[PDB]
Symmetry: D2
Amino acid sequence: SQFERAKIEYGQWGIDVEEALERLKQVPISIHCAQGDDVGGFELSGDYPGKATTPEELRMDLEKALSLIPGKHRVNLHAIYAETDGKVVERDQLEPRHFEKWVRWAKRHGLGLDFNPTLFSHEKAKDGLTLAHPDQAIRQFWIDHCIASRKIGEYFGKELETPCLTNIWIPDGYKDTPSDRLTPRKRLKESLDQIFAAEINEAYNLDAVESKLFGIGSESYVVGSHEFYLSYALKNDKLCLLDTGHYHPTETVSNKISAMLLFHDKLALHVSRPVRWDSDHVVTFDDELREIALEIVRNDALDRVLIGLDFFDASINRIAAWTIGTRNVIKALLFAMLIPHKQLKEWQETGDYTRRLAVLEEFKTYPLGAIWNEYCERMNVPIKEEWLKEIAIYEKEVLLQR
Amino acid sequence: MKSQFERAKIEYGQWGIDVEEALERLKQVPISIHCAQGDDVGGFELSGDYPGKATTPEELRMDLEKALSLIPGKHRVNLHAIYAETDGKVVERDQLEPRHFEKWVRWAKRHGLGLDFNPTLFSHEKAKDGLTLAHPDQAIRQFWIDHCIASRKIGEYFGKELETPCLTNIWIPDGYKDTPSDRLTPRKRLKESLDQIFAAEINEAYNLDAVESKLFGIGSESYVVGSHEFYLSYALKNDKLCLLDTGHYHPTETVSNKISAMLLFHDKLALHVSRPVRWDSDHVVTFDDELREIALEIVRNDALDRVLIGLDFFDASINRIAAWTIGTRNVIKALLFAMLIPHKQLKEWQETGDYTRRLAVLEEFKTYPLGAIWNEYCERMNVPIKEEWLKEIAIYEKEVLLQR
Amino acid sequence: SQFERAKIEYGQWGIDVEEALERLKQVPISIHCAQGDDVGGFELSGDYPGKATTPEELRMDLEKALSLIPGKHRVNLHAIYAETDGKVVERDQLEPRHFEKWVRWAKRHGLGLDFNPTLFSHEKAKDGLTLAHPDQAIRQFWIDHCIASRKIGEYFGKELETPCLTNIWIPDGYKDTPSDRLTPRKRLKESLDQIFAAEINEAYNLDAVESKLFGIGSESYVVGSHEFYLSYALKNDKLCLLDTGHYHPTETVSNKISAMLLFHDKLALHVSRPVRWDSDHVVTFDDELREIALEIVRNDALDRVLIGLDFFDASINRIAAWTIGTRNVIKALLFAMLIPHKQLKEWQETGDYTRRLAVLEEFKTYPLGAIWNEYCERMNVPIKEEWLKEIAIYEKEVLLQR
Amino acid sequence: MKSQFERAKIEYGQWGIDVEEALERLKQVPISIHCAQGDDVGGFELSGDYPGKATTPEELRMDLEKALSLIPGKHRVNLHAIYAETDGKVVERDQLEPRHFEKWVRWAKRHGLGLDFNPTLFSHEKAKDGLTLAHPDQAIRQFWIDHCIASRKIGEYFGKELETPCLTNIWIPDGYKDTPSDRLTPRKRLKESLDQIFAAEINEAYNLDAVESKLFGIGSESYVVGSHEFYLSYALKNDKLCLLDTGHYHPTETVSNKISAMLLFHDKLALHVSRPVRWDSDHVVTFDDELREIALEIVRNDALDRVLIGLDFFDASINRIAAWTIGTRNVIKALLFAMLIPHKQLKEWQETGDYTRRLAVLEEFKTYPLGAIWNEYCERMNVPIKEEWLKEIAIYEKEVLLQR
Ligand SMILES: [Mn+2]
């Protein structure tokens, strides 16, 4: 009845809530694994306690998170989460077999997997240059790692019968002012053209490139910038990936979505909260998230934007992290599904800016919670703060064994 | 629908949150609505947008009543010196006296309204250089000094008449388009000028003084005389109020963060809320992240009587009554939202280091049935309930607005 | 002597200053006409005194300034600068013959001409949409108008024997939050496709598109975003023009030149001084300005980056404005010419981040004035502040009498 | 070589600028070099980067003398509490005394340097919650209070011995990573802790106390207890100095605009210049627009004795002696540039409305022969001519920094 009352209110505007709920149920969010062991990894190498120690602990943790999150979703894996045996394999030598257990586990749970080559925390990545390193030998090693990484995506997609997105992000740049911006960039372009040389069926693997404005130790210059990647990706029929953390002060991904859809057709984004740097805070139901959802739903792009999460806070419960974050992007999608686009578009189309504002503003007090809650039941997940209870139980008996 | 309110009351009461208490408290927080919005900053001195602006004081007060109709609770009007009511008789700004705002006081009194006041230091001959209380020539400074001193008198006059104090705010355009060659002298001049304005004491039961900083405005982008650090220091040293403008700061600088620091040393602040979009653009206020953050500071620091909330936007691309009612209702919605947060629990989770619960519940509380509360609140208070206000605006626009 | 002493100091690094001056003599700088009459123009339908009012007054004003700016340059014209007879001709109906006095004059002074359709201050631009207005009859008007403009662009290149660049800039956006970001941009794209339908020889005309992030009344959203134009230009083999005042706080055009040049080949620019909004302050010899220049020089892009000026300061002497803004940008090119790029490239390549910083910093005190003053002597323009005298004269006798 | 200077001295002469005067005052102004840069914020408490970092007090002092070899003029060294010399002894921070800095004071005296001081409220067991003076735990609060008092005492000691006052600046890292649910009570506690630190009366002839705001740190991204607005109000009420750091501000935010407003209310003023690149990233100070604007401000406003200038930077990735010398020589160049600007004529033009000349000459001055003047100055002061100091750093790194 609570629900039922909410349903009518949306009804008056022609919003079909059941339809919205039915399409929402479908959309997959790709959850990053890094959150669970604090970017550790199993590659032979103070904060909130009981992070995962092993892939077995790591997988357990995801299932728990996943069981608190409505819908059916995906795990975004990194090259360093390889299960070599006890045998240490160098990164340019990674192969599908290194990911059997991951894949087998994903299939059992009916999940999709996404991949990323890992281009940091490594002997050959300490100069802060990787694909753009002045040393041929270093570039190859990294080129080979990415090529390897692409085949692993291909393995994933074949197996999971849903295309893997393999995304390249590199830490490349310099700390202080560079005396030359162009040539590293030329080295990066050449390196990529190599990485992407062999074709793979777009049914199994998709390729993305990710820019960053600045990082720690790359304050002043980043090789693979926005304009760089936007252009590169455009020439070579690849996907851009946009991180809500990697741009200028005041700069929004929401504003970029619709321009990008006119020329690209598929588009990847990682949502994370910047708090004044690519800080990787847990995603929150804020204005920019709402504006991103709005843009996604309105531009009829629920199958063209591959939503991924990217965030790392070690100060708080790692399961709560995943679940807060993921539950936020879904709520946001939902809110954007429950909005009168047609009346709103036709009002801006005809100059009535007055009601466009009034109504965008009024829907902020409509009963999202009554639909949000109903949805959570229908989807077998705890309904409000109830989900904290499961975390508490879980942390006690297992999270706090190790 | 009464059930909707009732179920929500249970949902909130489960936290210790008393929605009846919160609504009572909300009832009496006054918002000061700026008049600059009715007539496109036009005023009534000797001196192709959106149609049907206000054109006489009779039109601006009708307009104001009309918006006040649609806004819940009981409020204040923020007047500017250029909305002075002379006859058809030019009186210079330094010659301004209570008599020139008698019609307004009486109107406010009848409708049970507070009046705040503002000297006007833009759009005038002795402002044409873009310097004012800090102009190089004595006679220009002395003029704007006499004008501000006049405006303090008028504010004292409102306080006396309306038996609720009037904040007289001082904002000046002074600055330079391009890089300056001296940043001090003009500030020295501002200081000396303000010292002269605040010389005569006025009872604080009638009139409080504010000073408003700006980072930049157009024509005035390289440097502004009345800077943030300047007026922070001045108000402290001289026991005056800072007025803070949500629109008058750096990229990403938020006032929400400033309130706590300032309540520790000042005991009363003023705010002007407006929406900047990339500059002091003066957009209608929205229920957004920052407006809720401001509200949380006000409520949770128990500064509901310490923070004088006023609005300050000018949208002449949309209907002006609607402008008023959206903005004003948005801030009330925010205060409400802040009144329905489990502060005690949140504060305690912080002191304890339980950042998991703090974020989880802050976040959770963003889908609680705020609307059900708001709707009921709107109805006890005789305003249209959701979109409905938009229907009276449609009528008023044809009915009166557009025979004008 | 002074110059000969300076010369030796740069000569110690392998820096031939004689050669730098030789190449500096040949770089054109495209000066905007807007600055002369405060964007008035000659269409039938407070600030500092002495502003131009007539075609005749504006040509004298450009000549004055050109005569205080060393070298040979071009003038950048807008469509509202058409000289109909006393006739009145609609913007879609403008023809080469409406600019033939302009051409004759530049032939007479050895100047290139650049072009711009004007899509603002007009009835058919008053809803703030233009190439993207919902009304097809509005769009077509503007489509034709830009087409007319390209034809004029062709005229200049033919007549003057130097390609003309015809840059499109539109004011299109909304002040307040759009309820649709997608459908306005789809329309820009279709308008531009139509505009660029006819091919024109690259030796006579080039096209460029110019992004912007916001304007006044254009605050919340702007159709011609940076992502739209970069994508469009790349797909359609057109030039991107970048305006230093047209981006996010802390966002730098300098950082973009290097990547742009990897994919375009030809790049267009406008140098403005943003002061907290797109405000059009005279360009000053600043860090970003220097940085831009370095980037243009190291990258071997003097022929590849088309340097235009765009600013409008009505608060000072207008002839002063032009001469301060141009000499500055020349100045910066000079500065970058007198940089030990190869020793600096190497140290970067090599990891000697210490020398790099050290010497880039050390060059900020090198004897540029000496060189800059020599250059102005050889180029028959006044040498330090003495061009001010010539302004004071021109102001007394000519300007203050209109 | 001495005529290059001569020809240059004349060009400046024409504007009635006295270049001899300029250098004779430039010689006087002390810069305060931070010790952190020499050993990578190591310290000597009992607890991938460029090699040869300093590892002991003798080594760090030797390092320091090396950098002053190459920096013209006479200076000061900004010490941190953790650089205490306890023999083999292990003394806690609240237990720190003037004897634990005797070597330092003996050394600075022989080389004729002033010494500034900072307590250290990070890298400690009792600062792991990211809270310090604002921790909820009174004992922890007490502990740091105790430690701060201690360092005011040690600074006093510095003033007496070196016959010039020591600035003891307080910077704390207190804040939260994620959105807080209370911005006020944590600042209530800092206020209170500061009141205690400062209750112990200490002679200003010998020690001055400063307080340092930061906007965000990694791990304190959402909120810092030390608001700019908090310290700015604090220092004014309690007669202390604000210390301004060029990296602890909002994007586009400048210290150079804050100087004039501050000097007007404060008398004395400290700053740390560091290069921020998109965060308090502590890069080596470069001769840039903002460094140029700060120096103009200090010079024009007659403040060479009202602005205490310290360096604060740590770039672990270049030669650390180079870092000190590039940086210090830059602020000095900047000062020097500001000394060679026709302030009077420029001031007159602003006053007068001639923004045309104001802009034209400030720019024209950017190509005047600063290098000619700066070279002579360098020679006169017995430091390496130009780049030539890179030669002395290579000689030092080879036969010294790398016998480690
Ligand atoms: Mn990322």
